[PDB]
Write a protein that binds this DNA or RNA. Structure first.
Lengths: 47, 285, 119, 92
RNA sequence: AUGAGCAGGUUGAAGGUUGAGUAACAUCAACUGGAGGACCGAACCGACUCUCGUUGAAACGAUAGCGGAUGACUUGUGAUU
RNA sequence: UGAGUAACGCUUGGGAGUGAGAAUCUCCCAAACCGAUUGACUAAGGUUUCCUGGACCAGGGUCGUCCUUCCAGGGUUAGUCUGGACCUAAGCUGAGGCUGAAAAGCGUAGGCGAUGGACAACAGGUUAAUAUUCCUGUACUUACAGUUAGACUGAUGGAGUGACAAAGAAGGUUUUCCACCCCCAUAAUUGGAUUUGGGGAUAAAUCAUAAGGUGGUACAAUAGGCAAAUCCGUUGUGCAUAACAUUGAGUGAUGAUGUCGAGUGAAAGUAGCGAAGGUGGUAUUAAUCAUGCUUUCAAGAAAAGCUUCUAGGGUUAAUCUAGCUGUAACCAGUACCGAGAACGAACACACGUAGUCAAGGAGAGGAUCCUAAGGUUAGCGAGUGAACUAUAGCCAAGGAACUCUGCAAAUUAACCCCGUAAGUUAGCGAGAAGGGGUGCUUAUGUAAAAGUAAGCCGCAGUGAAGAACGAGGGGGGACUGUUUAACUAAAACACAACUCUAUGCCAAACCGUAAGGUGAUGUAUAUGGGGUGACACCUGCCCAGUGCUGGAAGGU
């Protein structure tokens, strides 16, 4: 049938891509939170 | 003229009446020109960000609204002649192409009772009162057919520009200002005595006779069918709710915003337009 | 219950029997499952018996049991059989071939049997 | 060009087949900090001779050593197929 | 907003041309027209039903039919709440 | 523990080899069907899963000598293709700015942004690759500069163009098919005979030739598109009726002494060789003409681009064009799978989906069955014919007696010829009902045919597969359609339309707070809300109260 999730790389890179989140201050603060979490997947490039 | 014929449908019946568009006009094909066209698109009744503003929008066919000019001050008193009176699907009337003798073609809302070939002209000076002619209101007598009346000194015509709609002059005031008009919609006001108004009655007096017939035609005109207010949850429409078709039980039922609309004083009384009122569907002033 | 394997059928048995009779025609010695041998012995003995009549009608009839092989073709098999092999088995009434029990299969323990033919 | 965008040639039996061709087809692993014009000018200054044809493909970082105790990724390496003039050859 | 697509068979409409016809209308004949929230009927859509599956490949399924299937049509893409 | 329980996640045979070891690996040949799909192009994606060799710690619902598994190594080539360097659509941002405690929302110029616009090569070949990407040939374009020659052009601005629906129809156009020939091959035992299979084409590019098509074309003056006009707008004369601006299928020759070809086919079906390389009708077929034309209304983008106008000017030249020559064509993609075991779906999942094309036989047609091309072994099997359980095939006899029930099943179904009732708002009713026939051969038959006559056969003649079981009565709902993803899909919802009310521009209203926007680029024959809810006639008493509206005195 119709899947809830699709492997739309472009659509995801436009929804939760780096620049989509850096364009807003809240996204940068979320990235600082992830920084504090020391994660390996940070953004679409540093995933 | 409207006509309704059996559509040979084997599931229900319809009442779809259609206008001839052929004996009243040239050959029936959409004839566009590159001179004057600005497209209009369905807005869906939503805001500049996406939240709802207008109710059940969309469904109509995409159209390019013809650029219809009403300033009637760029070119005046220079002889012109109508070229082609044709429909404007983004409005309710038919429009006319005219060519000012300098060689300038433009559209104008065509009133009722005008034939192609006869010369017409907009003049800011005392001339004939033939329908379609444009006048300063300081030179108009009482009781003439006027349509598409402006509210400003060149603020564009706004009142009585739907199909089969017009207004009548009540002469000018005793003091000599704010020419008195017996408004459509059962009102009476006093406009500026200097307004540029075009005499006549907006075309298609028979637009009140056309019948949609089938709900699909209605949707394709740009209307979305919607559930009634009573068949709703008690929220987002206050009078909705009830198990087993509970009707309205309160006087003057509410809108989806929960507001009285039965006869209630609703208009903006504190407007500047109210100060110039003789009859406003109610008593004096 | 929906689309699955059709499994064994009487028609499947018929084609399978014909395929092994063609195969043993091509080879003579077979190492198969014993059960198919005990099912095909009827047809093989009746073919040995009926091919001894040795006429064109018998050729038509035995045509309905052979296939196309790589070691021979159908027609030279018709010739060789009707010439020497089918007449060769007139010595004894019945008891044509030997199906002797081998061990089981390595995979699903299916009883191997060797099929050979001597008069 | 900068001439730093030429790392090494690559040689095998397929490269034997390529170079024995009349076009003198060679394959090089190259630093991708240059375009086709820049790569061919860099090759035009490493020895002073103009190449015949230049084309490039790349290999993206692929899983190196597959699944192992310490797995990882390969590197992004540019394979430039550069053909010398059909008559000229170099002896290195 | 921008695009693409929906076999075929049907039935045969509004309209219109000529003529009969009437003083003129009116009425009808021949002819064209090829539309119908028209019909089937495909793909396809959805799931009305009989049954099955009942830690099933199945977190909505398996066949058989079924209501449609050129319109109140679907979809593809992006965007927007 | 439950315990070997249920299961092995849509399916094979034989022989032989390797291998110590074979249903599971492969070599040969079988079988099975799909075949508008099990094809191919493939889009997206996963991105190495693609390949060679080695073995298969892990996994393969068993198996494993093997696998999308691992190990080592390796594979994807664009002057013309897609999208970049061109463009805008929805939409988005947005300095100097409206604007909101801060933070922020809004939006101008600007700047992004396809789902669309515009743009120069074909066939064949190769190898473990993959390739209009690399190459054989024939090409073509773009600029770049030089050169010569013609030699006034023309934006940044204006104008034309780009720049337009759905739907129908019949013309032309080449095909296709068939009649038919050529060539290759063909020569047959089992009864009878010399018979059947396949092929026959050749591009981009060039020109010649474009059947035709569209739709006005020379002159005069112009009242105007910020400014600027000769371009356009613009009224007459004139050619009108066709000159003309434009354009286009198709045909032929180069391409091509080539490819290819029925095929032949050595140490591999490979190295090599390679005939026919066609005629006429065509009631089928199909796509170029075609951005054609038409019917209708619910009336169908801009930007880039091309040219022109004056501009801007230069004219000891610029610019454009022509030729010639040199030069060059930069960014990422080109593997593989790719409606599924390489996407996801928890997965070797019996699961679902982008586009495009998709043969022969009958058939209206993608219905139907079997085959052409392609492709195949759905990762457990074997013995057996107990109960029970799924699926079927069968059932005589009654023919709804069972059920809460005609649930299920069933007669029904394709074609041809009839005929069809009352009622109807004149559309329907209506596959109405109900019936007749469909086979073969010999002829009549037209062009195949539809049909007709004579003879013959069956137990029946879509002799297989694909096809409605009705009639009437009552209730609501008119109705085609949407709905509770995922228990019950309708007499629910929607509804055309009716009725009433409200709303006159900085409209009311709505969102927001404003800003701002929709409303709306609307304008009382417009919109909203509140009731009804095919069609017809009505909507009877009551304003007590309140609701809403109104008013003028007055008590407050």
């Amino acid at each position: 049938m119709k899947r809830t999730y699709q492997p739309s790389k472009l659509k995801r890179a436009k929804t939760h891509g780096f620049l989509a989140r850096m364009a807003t201050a809240s996204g940068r603060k979320v990235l600082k939170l992830r920084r504090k979490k020391q994660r390996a997947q940070l953004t679409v490039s540093s995933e | 003229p409207i006509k309704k014929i059996i559509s040979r449908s084997n599931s229900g019946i319809h009442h779809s009446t259609v206008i001839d568009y052929k004996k009243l006009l040239t050959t029936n094909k959409n004839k566009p020109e590159k001179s004057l066209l600005v497209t209009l698109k369905k807005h869906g009744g939503r805001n500049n960000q996406g939240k709802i503003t207008v109710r059940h929008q969309g469904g109509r066919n995409k159209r390019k609204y013809r650029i219809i000019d009403f300033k009637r001050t760029h070119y005046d008193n220079i002889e012109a002649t109508v070229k082609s009176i044709e429909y404007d699907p983004n409005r309710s009337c038919f429009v006319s192409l005219i060519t000012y003798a300098n060689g300038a073609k433009s559209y104008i809302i065509s009133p009722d009772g005008i034939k192609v070939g006869d010369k017409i002209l907009a003049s800011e000076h005392p001339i004939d009162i033939k329908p379609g002619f444009s006048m300063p209101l300081a030179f108009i007598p009482e009781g003439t057919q006027v349509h598409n009346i402006e509210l400003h000194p060149k603020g564009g015509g706004q009142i009585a520009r739907s199909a089969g709609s017009y207004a009548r002059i009540l002469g000018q005031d005793e003091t000599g200002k704010y020419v008195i008009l017996q408004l459509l919609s059962g009102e009476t006001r006093k406009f500026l005595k200097e307004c540029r108004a075009t005499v006549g009655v907006v075309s298609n007096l028979d637009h009140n006779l056309v019948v949609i017939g089938k709900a699909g035609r209605n949707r394709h005109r740009g209307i979305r069918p919607t559930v009634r207010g009573s068949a709703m949850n008690p929220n987002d429409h206050p009078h909705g709710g009830g198990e087993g078709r509970s009707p309205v039980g309160r006087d003057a039922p509410r809108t989806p915003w929960g507001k009285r609309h039965m006869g209630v004083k609703t208009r903006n009384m504190k407007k500047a337009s109210t100060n110039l009122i003789i009859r406003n569907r109610k008593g004096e002033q | 219950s929906y689309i699955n394997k059709p499994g064994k059928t009487s028609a499947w048995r018929v084609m399978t029997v014909r395929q092994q009779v063609s195969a043993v025609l091509a080879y003579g010695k077979i190492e198969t499952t014993l059960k198919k041998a005990k099912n095909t012995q009827k047809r093989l003995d009746k073919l040995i018996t009926l091919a001894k009549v040795d006429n064109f009608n018998n050729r038509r009839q035995v045509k309905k049991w052979l296939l196309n092989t790589n070691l021979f073709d159908v027609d030279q098999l018709m010739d060789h059989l009707f010439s020497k092999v089918a007449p060769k088995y007139e010595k004894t009434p019945g008891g044509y071939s030997r199906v002797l029990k081998l061990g089981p299969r390595r995979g699903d323990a299916t009883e191997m049997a060797i099929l050979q033919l001597t008069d | 060009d900068v001439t730093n965008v030429l790392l090494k040639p690559v040689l095998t039996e397929k490269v034997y087949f390529n170079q024995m061709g009349e076009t003198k087809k060679y394959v090089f692993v190259v630093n991708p900090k240059a375009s086709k014009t820049r790569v061919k000018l860099a090759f035009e200054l490493v020895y002073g001779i103009k190449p015949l044809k230049v084309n490039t493909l790349i290999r993206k970082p692929t899983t190196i050593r597959g699944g192992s105790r310490f797995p990882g990724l390969s590197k992004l390496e540019k394979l430039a197929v550069i053909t010398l003039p059909k008559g000229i050859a170099i002896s290195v």
